[PDB]
Design a protein around this ligand. Structure first.
Ligand SMILES: CCCCN(Cc1cc(Cl)c(OC)c(OC)c1)c1ccc(C(O)(C(F)(F)F)C(F)(F)F)cc1
Ligand SMILES: CCCCN(Cc1cc(Cl)c(OC)c(OC)c1)c1ccc(C(O)(C(F)(F)F)C(F)(F)F)cc1
Ligand SMILES: CC1=C(/C=C/C(C)=C\C=C\C(C)=C\C(=O)O)C(C)(C)CCC1
Ligand SMILES: CC1=C(/C=C/C(C)=C\C=C\C(C)=C\C(=O)O)C(C)(C)CCC1
Lengths: 196, 238, 198, 242
């Protein structure tokens, strides 16, 4: 059956200049990615080396999805993990407006219009995480297998939970190409010691 | 839920349009500079050859896109934008469809077969050649047929998040048609293999990366003073 | 025979034969084609396997271009002269928010070149040393490239001793610009419509 | 044409300052968290304890480099902000020079303190990526092949500390003047002590170029550690984090 409990996945999600405000937000969250992925089924049974590889490869898309979902509320910007906000207008004034709009239109906006839920966002983040194509993977097929388990589980969840919307599963996945493209464009003591 | 006569007809139209593009390309194959070890000239001729091929493929994609329900009913502005970014993706899907797992080579226009070396001897770098060959081998494992490739290509073309798309709303409506058809089609023809559909859609994600790796290949060829011809440059440089 | 193994004369010939940020990138793009044209004139480089030539240029290109416009910028005051002929002043660089790395270019490269009056042959040699970098990945024979770079060491030193016998420390002063260059380098990192309607 | 008394004296001081800093720091070798003996490759905790071990020794190395910098004529006469500016950016390069000095070509390891050898595997086991480990090992190998002596590493260390282009240097001219003195000494030394190996000098200076790359690779390694648990202890943090 579903060997990728959406319960656990949702749990993990629960467990956790304008540019400088975002960069500071990222640092605060960088230190949750191991605790988040910790709580994802079967991740901790992967070789330590591989786990590092999957977070190294996934981290930025992992972070982007999350703050995106969170900003479903805000009207024209994002709620950072710092508690602050960033409005379109200061994003454009800074110089990262084009990439900002992409996130608003292709992510934020879309997640709101379809009201994707925390369980869904989490399964998507689990798919991003279980990426078998990352270089240096010890057993790619293993990660491949775990990514498909999320396929199955996410679908079953959608079918049962939203049986009126037969295209919902497919609609979630189709957020991932946009995430990928967005992700790619988004890339004292000494004094004392001296004196003493 | 099944496929209606209309959807079966639309699918057939797609496969037919692609076959039709194949024949005209094949018929126009003689137009391309002929395939010629430390020789710069030979290397430049192999690159001339590939760019000529690629121009032929661009014409195939445009002819095929002009035949998609609703495509012409968009602003020319949006048509250009959709073609400009989907081009390299469609070409990579076509590459996977033509991948020979035995000789690990790709055969274009019926009788033009190329392996890794052939691309290297044209001056292409390994960080470009390898992931594409890796992508093709993985796609080939899926054993997609004509219908499945035709739909995956049409889904790729109707991608609303391409830069400079005006009516993103309409593009998504158009895309939805083909996604709906592909889902129905897999569930009817691969009833026991429902992971097929998720897997196919996930290729669309890899193409994003592969598109980026192709951009890097382009700026790299430039380090060798190998510029793209006008049409390609317009699509892939600018 | 140090110069014979790596003729300083050929290197000079090689050099002879060839918003602000947007304008700088454009100038850079314009200068791309000169990389192969410059390199083939540097002795022994064309004897390397085509694959290694490509790797050497892919690895060195930004350092090669930075060295060149810096030397060209000797005459300009607190700015650089692009290959397109535009000047870019300090003041315009800060306003565009690249003033950090721009100031480093001016003081570590342009000013140093000015004050020592580094000549075209020296510049060419420094660029040859950047070119012949044996530590780039995927080289078919790094030891070969390394032998070539050591031939520039010896040839450059002989030239410095000959042309500038009063400056015993000159050679070392030329080399002492490569680390700063390297760090600057690291930091710096119709038709379609026809087809449609027809 | 030979080394002046001044240069001879200056080199004796450098060599002595290094050996003495080496012992001033020896007094707390085992005071460092020990190397695990856990036989579980998959243990996140044996792994965190290896990383802790290294960050501890790294802090001992930083202290030693600061102790050595103070012994450099001219360093203490620089503004306090300049001294810091030079130290924060020179630190990793000196540690890598120090690393290359202690590379054992036979076992392919680096010995930090008698019976403290470490190979590539040992560093991977602390969670350090291969794009950091391999270049450093390649660098230490090539450095070892030059067979520099104590005086040469010491001069090289001083040239590296006295780099005028480090971010936030105010008195660039004084720093250059200071560095020129060591470069000039190294040249005379190489020429007197390697009379039939002239390329030794340019090869040594080119190593200062490689250091800049390795420093960049090191800073990528610091970011990568954040993607795990591994935060840097407070001293290493202000030097390297941001
Ligand atoms: C290693 C395999 C990559 C081949 N591809 C895709 C592709 C190339 C050609 Cl020539 C096609 O013509 C039939 C085609 O149709 C399916 C698909 C490829 C694509 C683009 C390039 C280039 O853009 C570049 F610059 F990367 F070399 C160019 F067209 F210039 F060759 C190279 C290889
Ligand atoms: C793979 C070999 C590189 C080791 N280095 C240089 C180095 C390390 C230590 Cl622990 C030293 O003290 C004995 C030393 O002086 C000889 C030189 C190295 C340097 C820094 C790090 C780290 O900054 C990081 F983050 F990269 F891991 C840290 F200190 F945190 F371990 C790691 C290895
Ligand atoms: C989006 C964006 C950027 C990248 C942001 C990244 C990569 C992560 C943010 C993470 C947060 C902000 C997580 C959280 O707050 O939970 C940069 C800076 C390139 C430019 C401005 C737009
Ligand atoms: C230096 C510098 C930058 C990089 C310049 C590069 C990498 C090449 C320039 C080449 C030229 C300018 C050649 C010429 O004009 O002859 C960028 C824009 C990143 C930031 C501004 C400062």
């Amino acid at each position: 059956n579903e060997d990728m409990p959406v319960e656990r996945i949702l749990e993990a999600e629960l467990a956790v200049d304008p540019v400088t405000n975002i960069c500071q937000a990222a640092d605060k969250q960088l230190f949750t990615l191991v605790e988040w992925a910790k709580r994802i089924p079967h991740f901790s049974e992967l070789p330590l080396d591989d786990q590092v590889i999957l977070l190294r490869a996934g981290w930025n898309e992992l972070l982007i999805a999350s703050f995106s979902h969170r900003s479903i509320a805000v009207k024209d910007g994002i709620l950072l993990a710092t508690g602050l906000h960033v409005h379109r207008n200061s994003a454009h004034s800074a110089g990262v407006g084009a990439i900002f709009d992409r996130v608003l239109t292709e992510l934020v906006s879309k997640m709101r219009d379809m009201q994707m839920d925390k369980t869904e966002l989490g399964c998507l983040r689990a798919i991003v995480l279980f990426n078998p194509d990352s270089k240096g993977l010890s057993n790619p097929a293993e990660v491949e297998a775990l990514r498909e388990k999320v396929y199955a589980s996410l679908e079953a969840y959608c079918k049962h939970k939203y049986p009126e919307q037969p295209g919902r599963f497919a609609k979630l996945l189709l957020r991932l190409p946009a995430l990928r493209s967005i992700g790619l464009k988004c890339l004292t003591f000494l004094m004392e010691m001296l004196e003493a | 839920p099944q496929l209606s006569p209309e959807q079966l007809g639309m699918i057939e139209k797609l496969v037919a349009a692609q076959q039709q593009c194949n024949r005209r390309s094949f018929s126009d194959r003689l137009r391309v500079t002929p395939w010629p070890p430390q020789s710069r000239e030979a290397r430049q001729q192999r690159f001339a050859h590939f760019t000529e091929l690629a121009i032929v493929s661009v014409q195939e994609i445009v002819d095929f896109a002009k035949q998609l329900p609703g495509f012409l009913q968009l602003s020319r502005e949006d048509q250009i934008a959709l073609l400009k970014t989907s081009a390299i993706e469609v070409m990579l899907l076509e590459t996977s469809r033509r991948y020979n797992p035995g000789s690990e080579s790709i055969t274009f226009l019926k009788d033009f077969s190329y392996n890794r070396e052939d691309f290297a001897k044209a001056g292409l770098q390994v960080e470009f050649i390898n992931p594409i060959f890796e992508f093709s081998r993985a796609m080939n494992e899926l054993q997609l047929n004509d219908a499945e490739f035709a739909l995956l290509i049409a889904i790729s073309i109707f991608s609303a998040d391409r830069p400079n798309v005006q009516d993103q709303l309409q593009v998504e409506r158009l895309q939805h048609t083909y996604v709906e058809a592909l889902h129905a089609y897999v569930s009817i023809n691969h009833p026991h293999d429902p992971l097929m559909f998720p897997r196919m859609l996930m290729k669309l994600v890899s193409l994003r990366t592969l598109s980026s790796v192709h951009s890097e290949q382009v700026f790299a060829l430039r380090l060798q003073d190998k510029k793209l011809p006008p049409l390609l440059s317009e699509i892939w440089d600018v």
